Amino acid sequence: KMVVTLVVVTTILESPYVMMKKNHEMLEGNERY
């Protein structure tokens, strides 16, 4: 074939500021919180 030639945002779980979601285990990323 053609051959080539060569922001960390921290927080803590405190209500109502940061709370867990309902399906938190079934989500990933920033949508978990």
Side-chain angles (χ1 to χ4, degrees), residues 2-20 23-24 27 29-30 32-33:
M2 182 176 288
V3 178
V4 175
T5 299
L6 295 174
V7 174
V8 176
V9 177
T10 182
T11 186
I12 195 165
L13 296 174
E14 290 293 327
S15 297
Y17 295 101
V18 172
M19 295 182 286
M20 296 299 290
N23 52 4
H24 62 87
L27 293 175
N30 294 319
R32 294 178 292 173
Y33 300 98

PDB file of all heavy atoms in Angstrom, unseen atoms left out:
ATOM      1  N   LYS A   1       0.842  -1.184   0.000  1.00  0.00           N
ATOM      2  CA  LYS A   1       0.000   0.000   0.000  1.00  0.00           C
ATOM      3  C   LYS A   1       0.885   1.244   0.000  1.00  0.00           C
ATOM      4  O   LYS A   1       2.097   1.170  -0.219  1.00  0.00           O
ATOM      5  CB  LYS A   1      -0.955  -0.029   1.192  1.00  0.00           C
ATOM      6  N   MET A   2       0.284   2.407   0.240  1.00  0.00           N
ATOM      7  CA  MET A   2       1.038   3.654   0.312  1.00  0.00           C
ATOM      8  C   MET A   2       1.825   3.701   1.615  1.00  0.00           C
ATOM      9  O   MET A   2       1.244   3.803   2.698  1.00  0.00           O
ATOM     10  CB  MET A   2       0.101   4.850   0.200  1.00  0.00           C
ATOM     11  CG  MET A   2       0.824   6.181   0.219  1.00  0.00           C
ATOM     12  SD  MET A   2      -0.302   7.562  -0.021  1.00  0.00           S
ATOM     13  CE  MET A   2      -0.687   7.333  -1.753  1.00  0.00           C
ATOM     14  N   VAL A   3       3.148   3.632   1.508  1.00  0.00           N
ATOM     15  CA  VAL A   3       4.037   3.648   2.661  1.00  0.00           C
ATOM     16  C   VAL A   3       4.437   5.090   2.938  1.00  0.00           C
ATOM     17  O   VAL A   3       4.906   5.796   2.036  1.00  0.00           O
ATOM     18  CB  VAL A   3       5.272   2.763   2.418  1.00  0.00           C
ATOM     19  CG1 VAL A   3       6.225   2.830   3.602  1.00  0.00           C
ATOM     20  CG2 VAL A   3       4.849   1.329   2.143  1.00  0.00           C
ATOM     21  N   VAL A   4       4.246   5.529   4.178  1.00  0.00           N
ATOM     22  CA  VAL A   4       4.568   6.893   4.568  1.00  0.00           C
ATOM     23  C   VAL A   4       6.077   7.075   4.717  1.00  0.00           C
ATOM     24  O   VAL A   4       6.859   6.119   4.693  1.00  0.00           O
ATOM     25  CB  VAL A   4       3.878   7.283   5.888  1.00  0.00           C
ATOM     26  CG1 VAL A   4       4.329   8.663   6.336  1.00  0.00           C
ATOM     27  CG2 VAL A   4       2.365   7.232   5.733  1.00  0.00           C
ATOM     28  N   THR A   5       6.483   8.333   4.877  1.00  0.00           N
ATOM     29  CA  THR A   5       7.879   8.694   5.125  1.00  0.00           C
ATOM     30  C   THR A   5       7.871   9.909   6.047  1.00  0.00           C
ATOM     31  O   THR A   5       7.555  11.022   5.614  1.00  0.00           O
ATOM     32  CB  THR A   5       8.627   8.983   3.829  1.00  0.00           C
ATOM     33  OG1 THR A   5       8.619   7.816   2.997  1.00  0.00           O
ATOM     34  CG2 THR A   5      10.067   9.375   4.121  1.00  0.00           C
ATOM     35  N   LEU A   6       8.203   9.692   7.313  1.00  0.00           N
ATOM     36  CA  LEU A   6       8.223  10.770   8.295  1.00  0.00           C
ATOM     37  C   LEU A   6       9.640  11.025   8.795  1.00  0.00           C
ATOM     38  O   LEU A   6      10.379  10.089   9.098  1.00  0.00           O
ATOM     39  CB  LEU A   6       7.300  10.443   9.471  1.00  0.00           C
ATOM     40  CG  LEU A   6       5.804  10.352   9.153  1.00  0.00           C
ATOM     41  CD1 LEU A   6       5.026   9.879  10.371  1.00  0.00           C
ATOM     42  CD2 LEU A   6       5.276  11.690   8.659  1.00  0.00           C
ATOM     43  N   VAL A   7      -8.509  21.440  33.272  1.00  0.00           N
ATOM     44  CA  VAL A   7      -8.279  22.209  34.489  1.00  0.00           C
ATOM     45  C   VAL A   7      -8.824  21.459  35.697  1.00  0.00           C
ATOM     46  O   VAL A   7     -10.011  21.149  35.761  1.00  0.00           O
ATOM     47  CB  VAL A   7      -8.901  23.611  34.387  1.00  0.00           C
ATOM     48  CG1 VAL A   7      -8.783  24.343  35.714  1.00  0.00           C
ATOM     49  CG2 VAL A   7      -8.226  24.405  33.283  1.00  0.00           C
ATOM     50  N   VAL A   8      -7.943  21.176  36.652  1.00  0.00           N
ATOM     51  CA  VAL A   8      -8.303  20.422  37.848  1.00  0.00           C
ATOM     52  C   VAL A   8      -9.115  21.332  38.765  1.00  0.00           C
ATOM     53  O   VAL A   8      -8.598  22.321  39.290  1.00  0.00           O
ATOM     54  CB  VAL A   8      -7.060  19.882  38.567  1.00  0.00           C
ATOM     55  CG1 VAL A   8      -7.459  19.178  39.853  1.00  0.00           C
ATOM     56  CG2 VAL A   8      -6.289  18.944  37.655  1.00  0.00           C
ATOM     57  N   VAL A   9     -10.386  20.999  38.956  1.00  0.00           N
ATOM     58  CA  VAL A   9     -11.281  21.744  39.832  1.00  0.00           C
ATOM     59  C   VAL A   9     -11.607  20.848  41.016  1.00  0.00           C
ATOM     60  O   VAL A   9     -12.271  19.815  40.862  1.00  0.00           O
ATOM     61  CB  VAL A   9     -12.555  22.189  39.103  1.00  0.00           C
ATOM     62  CG1 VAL A   9     -13.493  22.898  40.067  1.00  0.00           C
ATOM     63  CG2 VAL A   9     -12.204  23.082  37.923  1.00  0.00           C
ATOM     64  N   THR A  10     -11.147  21.237  42.203  1.00  0.00           N
ATOM     65  CA  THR A  10     -11.348  20.430  43.394  1.00  0.00           C
ATOM     66  C   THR A  10     -12.502  20.961  44.236  1.00  0.00           C
ATOM     67  O   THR A  10     -12.798  22.161  44.247  1.00  0.00           O
ATOM     68  CB  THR A  10     -10.064  20.359  44.228  1.00  0.00           C
ATOM     69  OG1 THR A  10     -10.278  19.519  45.372  1.00  0.00           O
ATOM     70  CG2 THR A  10      -9.599  21.745  44.673  1.00  0.00           C
ATOM     71  N   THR A  11     -13.169  20.038  44.924  1.00  0.00           N
ATOM     72  CA  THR A  11     -14.280  20.349  45.813  1.00  0.00           C
ATOM     73  C   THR A  11     -14.444  19.189  46.788  1.00  0.00           C
ATOM     74  O   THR A  11     -13.665  18.232  46.781  1.00  0.00           O
ATOM     75  CB  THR A  11     -15.574  20.607  45.033  1.00  0.00           C
ATOM     76  OG1 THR A  11     -16.600  21.033  45.936  1.00  0.00           O
ATOM     77  CG2 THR A  11     -16.021  19.345  44.298  1.00  0.00           C
ATOM     78  N   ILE A  12     -15.469  19.284  47.634  1.00  0.00           N
ATOM     79  CA  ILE A  12     -15.780  18.247  48.609  1.00  0.00           C
ATOM     80  C   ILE A  12     -17.291  18.037  48.602  1.00  0.00           C
ATOM     81  O   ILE A  12     -18.061  18.937  48.252  1.00  0.00           O
ATOM     82  CB  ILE A  12     -15.225  18.620  50.013  1.00  0.00           C
ATOM     83  CG1 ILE A  12     -15.208  17.418  50.963  1.00  0.00           C
ATOM     84  CG2 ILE A  12     -15.982  19.797  50.613  1.00  0.00           C
ATOM     85  CD1 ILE A  12     -14.364  17.623  52.200  1.00  0.00           C
ATOM     86  N   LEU A  13     -17.709  16.820  48.939  1.00  0.00           N
ATOM     87  CA  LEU A  13     -19.122  16.448  48.934  1.00  0.00           C
ATOM     88  C   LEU A  13     -19.821  17.118  50.107  1.00  0.00           C
ATOM     89  O   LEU A  13     -19.788  16.619  51.235  1.00  0.00           O
ATOM     90  CB  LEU A  13     -19.266  14.933  49.009  1.00  0.00           C
ATOM     91  CG  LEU A  13     -18.721  14.118  47.837  1.00  0.00           C
ATOM     92  CD1 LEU A  13     -18.806  12.631  48.140  1.00  0.00           C
ATOM     93  CD2 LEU A  13     -19.471  14.449  46.563  1.00  0.00           C
ATOM     94  N   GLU A  14     -20.452  18.260  49.852  1.00  0.00           N
ATOM     95  CA  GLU A  14     -21.244  18.951  50.859  1.00  0.00           C
ATOM     96  C   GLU A  14     -22.557  19.401  50.241  1.00  0.00           C
ATOM     97  O   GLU A  14     -22.565  20.022  49.174  1.00  0.00           O
ATOM     98  CB  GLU A  14     -20.498  20.158  51.441  1.00  0.00           C
ATOM     99  CG  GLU A  14     -19.317  19.798  52.326  1.00  0.00           C
ATOM    100  CD  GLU A  14     -19.741  19.120  53.616  1.00  0.00           C
ATOM    101  OE1 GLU A  14     -20.825  19.452  54.137  1.00  0.00           O
ATOM    102  OE2 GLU A  14     -18.990  18.250  54.104  1.00  0.00           O
ATOM    103  N   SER A  15     -23.657  19.083  50.910  1.00  0.00           N
ATOM    104  CA  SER A  15     -24.978  19.486  50.458  1.00  0.00           C
ATOM    105  C   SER A  15     -25.252  20.934  50.859  1.00  0.00           C
ATOM    106  O   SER A  15     -24.866  21.353  51.956  1.00  0.00           O
ATOM    107  CB  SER A  15     -26.048  18.580  51.055  1.00  0.00           C
ATOM    108  OG  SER A  15     -25.885  17.244  50.614  1.00  0.00           O
ATOM    109  N   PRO A  16     -25.909  21.731  50.007  1.00  0.00           N
ATOM    110  CA  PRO A  16     -26.363  21.402  48.653  1.00  0.00           C
ATOM    111  C   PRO A  16     -25.360  21.843  47.598  1.00  0.00           C
ATOM    112  O   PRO A  16     -25.723  22.000  46.431  1.00  0.00           O
ATOM    113  CB  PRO A  16     -27.654  22.204  48.523  1.00  0.00           C
ATOM    114  CG  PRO A  16     -27.376  23.427  49.327  1.00  0.00           C
ATOM    115  CD  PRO A  16     -26.504  22.992  50.482  1.00  0.00           C
ATOM    116  N   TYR A  17     -24.111  22.049  48.013  1.00  0.00           N
ATOM    117  CA  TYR A  17     -23.103  22.590  47.109  1.00  0.00           C
ATOM    118  C   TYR A  17     -22.659  21.545  46.092  1.00  0.00           C
ATOM    119  O   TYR A  17     -22.698  21.784  44.880  1.00  0.00           O
ATOM    120  CB  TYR A  17     -21.912  23.102  47.911  1.00  0.00           C
ATOM    121  CG  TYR A  17     -22.248  24.280  48.789  1.00  0.00           C
ATOM    122  CD1 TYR A  17     -22.470  24.110  50.150  1.00  0.00           C
ATOM    123  CD2 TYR A  17     -22.344  25.559  48.259  1.00  0.00           C
ATOM    124  CE1 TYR A  17     -22.775  25.186  50.961  1.00  0.00           C
ATOM    125  CE2 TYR A  17     -22.651  26.642  49.061  1.00  0.00           C
ATOM    126  CZ  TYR A  17     -22.865  26.449  50.411  1.00  0.00           C
ATOM    127  OH  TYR A  17     -23.170  27.522  51.215  1.00  0.00           O
ATOM    128  N   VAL A  18     -22.203  20.390  46.572  1.00  0.00           N
ATOM    129  CA  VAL A  18     -21.845  19.261  45.719  1.00  0.00           C
ATOM    130  C   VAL A  18     -22.524  18.024  46.290  1.00  0.00           C
ATOM    131  O   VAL A  18     -22.233  17.617  47.420  1.00  0.00           O
ATOM    132  CB  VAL A  18     -20.325  19.047  45.627  1.00  0.00           C
ATOM    133  CG1 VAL A  18     -20.022  17.758  44.885  1.00  0.00           C
ATOM    134  CG2 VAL A  18     -19.659  20.214  44.917  1.00  0.00           C
ATOM    135  N   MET A  19     -23.425  17.431  45.511  1.00  0.00           N
ATOM    136  CA  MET A  19     -24.173  16.260  45.928  1.00  0.00           C
ATOM    137  C   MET A  19     -24.046  15.160  44.884  1.00  0.00           C
ATOM    138  O   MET A  19     -23.769  15.416  43.711  1.00  0.00           O
ATOM    139  CB  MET A  19     -25.655  16.594  46.153  1.00  0.00           C
ATOM    140  CG  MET A  19     -25.906  17.554  47.304  1.00  0.00           C
ATOM    141  SD  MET A  19     -27.659  17.879  47.557  1.00  0.00           S
ATOM    142  CE  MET A  19     -28.006  18.946  46.159  1.00  0.00           C
ATOM    143  N   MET A  20     -24.251  13.927  45.331  1.00  0.00           N
ATOM    144  CA  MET A  20     -24.212  12.790  44.428  1.00  0.00           C
ATOM    145  C   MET A  20     -25.484  12.736  43.593  1.00  0.00           C
ATOM    146  O   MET A  20     -26.555  13.164  44.035  1.00  0.00           O
ATOM    147  CB  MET A  20     -24.044  11.490  45.215  1.00  0.00           C
ATOM    148  CG  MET A  20     -22.735  11.389  45.975  1.00  0.00           C
ATOM    149  SD  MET A  20     -21.292  11.436  44.895  1.00  0.00           S
ATOM    150  CE  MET A  20     -21.426   9.851  44.077  1.00  0.00           C
ATOM    151  N   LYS A  21     -25.363  12.214  42.376  1.00  0.00           N
ATOM    152  CA  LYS A  21     -26.528  12.042  41.526  1.00  0.00           C
ATOM    153  C   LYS A  21     -27.273  10.765  41.905  1.00  0.00           C
ATOM    154  O   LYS A  21     -26.844   9.990  42.767  1.00  0.00           O
ATOM    155  CB  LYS A  21     -26.117  12.003  40.054  1.00  0.00           C
ATOM    156  N   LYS A  22     -28.417  10.550  41.250  1.00  0.00           N
ATOM    157  CA  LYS A  22     -29.195   9.342  41.495  1.00  0.00           C
ATOM    158  C   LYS A  22     -28.500   8.119  40.912  1.00  0.00           C
ATOM    159  O   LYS A  22     -28.157   7.176  41.634  1.00  0.00           O
ATOM    160  CB  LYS A  22     -30.601   9.480  40.907  1.00  0.00           C
ATOM    161  N   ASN A  23     -28.280   8.117  39.601  1.00  0.00           N
ATOM    162  CA  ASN A  23     -27.529   7.054  38.932  1.00  0.00           C
ATOM    163  C   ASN A  23     -26.062   7.454  38.756  1.00  0.00           C
ATOM    164  O   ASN A  23     -25.534   7.550  37.647  1.00  0.00           O
ATOM    165  CB  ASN A  23     -28.194   6.692  37.605  1.00  0.00           C
ATOM    166  CG  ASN A  23     -28.447   7.901  36.707  1.00  0.00           C
ATOM    167  OD1 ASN A  23     -28.073   9.029  37.031  1.00  0.00           O
ATOM    168  ND2 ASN A  23     -29.082   7.660  35.566  1.00  0.00           N
ATOM    169  N   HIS A  24     -25.401   7.681  39.894  1.00  0.00           N
ATOM    170  CA  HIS A  24     -24.012   8.130  39.877  1.00  0.00           C
ATOM    171  C   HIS A  24     -23.065   7.033  39.411  1.00  0.00           C
ATOM    172  O   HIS A  24     -22.021   7.328  38.819  1.00  0.00           O
ATOM    173  CB  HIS A  24     -23.610   8.628  41.265  1.00  0.00           C
ATOM    174  CG  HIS A  24     -23.673   7.574  42.326  1.00  0.00           C
ATOM    175  ND1 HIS A  24     -22.621   6.725  42.596  1.00  0.00           N
ATOM    176  CD2 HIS A  24     -24.662   7.230  43.183  1.00  0.00           C
ATOM    177  CE1 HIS A  24     -22.960   5.904  43.575  1.00  0.00           C
ATOM    178  NE2 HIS A  24     -24.194   6.190  43.948  1.00  0.00           N
ATOM    179  N   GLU A  25     -23.408   5.769  39.664  1.00  0.00           N
ATOM    180  CA  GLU A  25     -22.579   4.668  39.190  1.00  0.00           C
ATOM    181  C   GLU A  25     -22.739   4.432  37.696  1.00  0.00           C
ATOM    182  O   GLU A  25     -21.830   3.881  37.067  1.00  0.00           O
ATOM    183  CB  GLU A  25     -22.912   3.388  39.958  1.00  0.00           C
ATOM    184  N   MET A  26     -23.868   4.835  37.116  1.00  0.00           N
ATOM    185  CA  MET A  26     -24.131   4.648  35.699  1.00  0.00           C
ATOM    186  C   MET A  26     -23.697   5.838  34.851  1.00  0.00           C
ATOM    187  O   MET A  26     -23.974   5.861  33.649  1.00  0.00           O
ATOM    188  CB  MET A  26     -25.619   4.373  35.475  1.00  0.00           C
ATOM    189  N   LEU A  27     -23.027   6.819  35.445  1.00  0.00           N
ATOM    190  CA  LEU A  27     -22.540   7.985  34.727  1.00  0.00           C
ATOM    191  C   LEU A  27     -21.027   8.086  34.871  1.00  0.00           C
ATOM    192  O   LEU A  27     -20.401   7.384  35.667  1.00  0.00           O
ATOM    193  CB  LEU A  27     -23.208   9.268  35.233  1.00  0.00           C
ATOM    194  CG  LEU A  27     -24.702   9.403  34.944  1.00  0.00           C
ATOM    195  CD1 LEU A  27     -25.261  10.651  35.607  1.00  0.00           C
ATOM    196  CD2 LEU A  27     -24.953   9.428  33.444  1.00  0.00           C
ATOM    197  N   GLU A  28     -20.441   8.982  34.078  1.00  0.00           N
ATOM    198  CA  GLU A  28     -19.004   9.199  34.098  1.00  0.00           C
ATOM    199  C   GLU A  28     -18.724  10.676  33.863  1.00  0.00           C
ATOM    200  O   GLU A  28     -19.569  11.419  33.356  1.00  0.00           O
ATOM    201  CB  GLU A  28     -18.304   8.341  33.042  1.00  0.00           C
ATOM    202  N   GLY A  29     -17.522  11.096  34.248  1.00  0.00           N
ATOM    203  CA  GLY A  29     -17.087  12.462  34.034  1.00  0.00           C
ATOM    204  C   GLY A  29     -17.692  13.469  34.991  1.00  0.00           C
ATOM    205  O   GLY A  29     -17.909  13.171  36.169  1.00  0.00           O
ATOM    206  N   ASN A  30     -17.969  14.666  34.488  1.00  0.00           N
ATOM    207  CA  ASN A  30     -18.479  15.763  35.302  1.00  0.00           C
ATOM    208  C   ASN A  30     -19.972  15.654  35.574  1.00  0.00           C
ATOM    209  O   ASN A  30     -20.484  16.380  36.432  1.00  0.00           O
ATOM    210  CB  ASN A  30     -18.175  17.101  34.623  1.00  0.00           C
ATOM    211  CG  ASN A  30     -16.689  17.400  34.565  1.00  0.00           C
ATOM    212  OD1 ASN A  30     -15.958  17.164  35.525  1.00  0.00           O
ATOM    213  ND2 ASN A  30     -16.235  17.916  33.431  1.00  0.00           N
ATOM    214  N   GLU A  31     -20.681  14.768  34.874  1.00  0.00           N
ATOM    215  CA  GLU A  31     -22.113  14.597  35.083  1.00  0.00           C
ATOM    216  C   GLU A  31     -22.438  13.743  36.300  1.00  0.00           C
ATOM    217  O   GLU A  31     -23.619  13.594  36.631  1.00  0.00           O
ATOM    218  CB  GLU A  31     -22.755  13.979  33.838  1.00  0.00           C
ATOM    219  N   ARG A  32     -21.428  13.180  36.967  1.00  0.00           N
ATOM    220  CA  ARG A  32     -21.664  12.373  38.154  1.00  0.00           C
ATOM    221  C   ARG A  32     -22.063  13.213  39.359  1.00  0.00           C
ATOM    222  O   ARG A  32     -22.690  12.689  40.285  1.00  0.00           O
ATOM    223  CB  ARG A  32     -20.413  11.562  38.493  1.00  0.00           C
ATOM    224  CG  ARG A  32     -20.052  10.513  37.460  1.00  0.00           C
ATOM    225  CD  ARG A  32     -18.770   9.789  37.839  1.00  0.00           C
ATOM    226  NE  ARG A  32     -17.607  10.671  37.771  1.00  0.00           N
ATOM    227  CZ  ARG A  32     -16.388  10.335  38.180  1.00  0.00           C
ATOM    228  NH1 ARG A  32     -16.168   9.130  38.691  1.00  0.00           N
ATOM    229  NH2 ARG A  32     -15.389  11.200  38.081  1.00  0.00           N
ATOM    230  N   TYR A  33     -21.717  14.495  39.367  1.00  0.00           N
ATOM    231  CA  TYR A  33     -21.928  15.359  40.519  1.00  0.00           C
ATOM    232  C   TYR A  33     -22.883  16.486  40.152  1.00  0.00           C
ATOM    233  O   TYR A  33     -23.011  16.856  38.982  1.00  0.00           O
ATOM    234  CB  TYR A  33     -20.600  15.932  41.014  1.00  0.00           C
ATOM    235  CG  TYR A  33     -19.616  14.870  41.446  1.00  0.00           C
ATOM    236  CD1 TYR A  33     -18.607  14.446  40.590  1.00  0.00           C
ATOM    237  CD2 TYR A  33     -19.704  14.285  42.704  1.00  0.00           C
ATOM    238  CE1 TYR A  33     -17.704  13.470  40.977  1.00  0.00           C
ATOM    239  CE2 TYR A  33     -18.806  13.308  43.099  1.00  0.00           C
ATOM    240  CZ  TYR A  33     -17.810  12.906  42.231  1.00  0.00           C
ATOM    241  OH  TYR A  33     -16.917  11.936  42.623  1.00  0.00           O
TER     242      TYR A  33
END
